[PDB]
Amino acid sequence: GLRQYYLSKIEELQLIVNDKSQNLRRLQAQRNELNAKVR
């Protein structure tokens, strides 16, 4: 099924997008402060 096998795979991935994305968002500015201290 496309509606009921395949659309069941959009519902799962987006959760990993939104939080691993957010962890990256925290970590990059956490590096960026240190880059400011470096230069």
Binding site: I10, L13, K20, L24, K37
Partner: protein, 102 residues
């Protein structure tokens, strides 16, 4: 089209996995990099050192001193100096040319 909606979306997880580990390298990488720079700056406090006397600061970490040559100056300072070691009337150290706190 529904078909690209899952393949192109796992495409960017497949892309996304190489960013948090990659800057997780940089949590330590600019530590071990930064400490090269950290002790590096103190070369100016070599040995040809002339003496001033601290007077006051405009702000944080930029100040005004009274030289033993008699004249006074608006100078900069080394960051590692504990600033709370300053001001009885502080005997300070000046660079002989660039004329800043040592």
């Amino acid at each position: 089209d529904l078909y690209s909606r899952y393949k192109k979306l796992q495409q960017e997880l497949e892309f996304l996995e190489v960013q948090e580990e990659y800057i997780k390298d940089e949590q330590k990488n600019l530590k071990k990099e930064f400490l090269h720079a950290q002790e590096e700056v103190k070369r100016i406090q070599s040995i040809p050192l002339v003496i001033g006397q601290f007077l006051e600061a405009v702000d944080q970490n930029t100040a005004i001193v009274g030289s033993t040559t008699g004249s006074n100056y608006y100078v900069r300072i080394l960051s590692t100096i504990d600033r709370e070691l300053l001001k009885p009337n502080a005997s300070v150290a000046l660079h002989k040319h660039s004329n800043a706190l040592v």
